[PDB]
Amino acid sequence: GANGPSSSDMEYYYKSLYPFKHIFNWLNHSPKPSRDMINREFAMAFRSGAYKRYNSFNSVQDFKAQIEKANPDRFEIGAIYNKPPREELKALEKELVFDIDMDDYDAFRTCCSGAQVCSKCWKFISLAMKITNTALREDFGYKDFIWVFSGRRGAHCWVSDKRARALTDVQRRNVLDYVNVIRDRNTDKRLALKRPYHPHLARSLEQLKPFFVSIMLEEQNPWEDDQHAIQTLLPALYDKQLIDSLKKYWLDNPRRSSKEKWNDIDQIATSLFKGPKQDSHIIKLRECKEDLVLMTLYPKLDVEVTKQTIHLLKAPFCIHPATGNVCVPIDESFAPEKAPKLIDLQTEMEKNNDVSLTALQPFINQFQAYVSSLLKNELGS
């Protein structure tokens, strides 16, 4: 319904649906309880706005009993410390995390407005995960990571490789800076990315180019609106004369599609830049356009959470308090409409009273299989 889950709804969820055993095993890195759980901080966020840090749990039974008793709207996972938080604390390890959310893509989408989301603009997030995954796998050699829907229109990545868990804050900042190519999110300005591109950017550009026509020019088409083209297409260009000529042209000939404007840029540039210097201008326009492909489609991380081993991040399978969606793990097929809603799970448990019979169970199965694979890598040979 329009209202999010009630307190008694949350009580039912933690009692009968939340997968405490698998989340415990994922964070403990072993089948016997160890200090990777006993010394790990969890924070609880209450419906009142209260926020309690430095909880810690010692077994799946204790994690479940404390969460059920507190009944928080969500809880968050922090670092593994040298002493148990519930009892000066030095952080030793924590999964490396990233957060991507639909906000910074809003200027280029037309399918949805405000807090809306749909499978079309979700492609911005699917691409963000694709490019981030390529860097994590190919450049950092990480093998154990999973993305989790954050409940409305974003996702979180949890990387559990032992190397990633042991990174220091300096190292985490260096990983973040490696992936966070678009540093300045402002669209009223041209990126002027450093040339020649670093091989990661060249690689990312080749991955993203085939999606630009189909997503940006055609599906979203944000530049058919002449004021939007002035606001976010023109600023990406490098030459004041080109920009003015295009402005006059689009004034004289209104509502040309994004595809038509995209080609108009080349046509007008070809007429403006002439003579043996022109090859230089051709290159600069191409580079501006490549940079704009990255401005529209390259992952725009919400950077802060990645940078420090102590930072807390919402646990997978928490309930979003406004949408009532479960924050489920994401596979290739996911879009937000596929996330189960708690009220729907409650209605299901009425006819078939076991979690294993609900729409939550495939996501729990995906997560359990993931946890299995991580534990196997943990042992090594």
Ligand SMILES: [Zn+2]
């Ligand atoms: Zn949409």
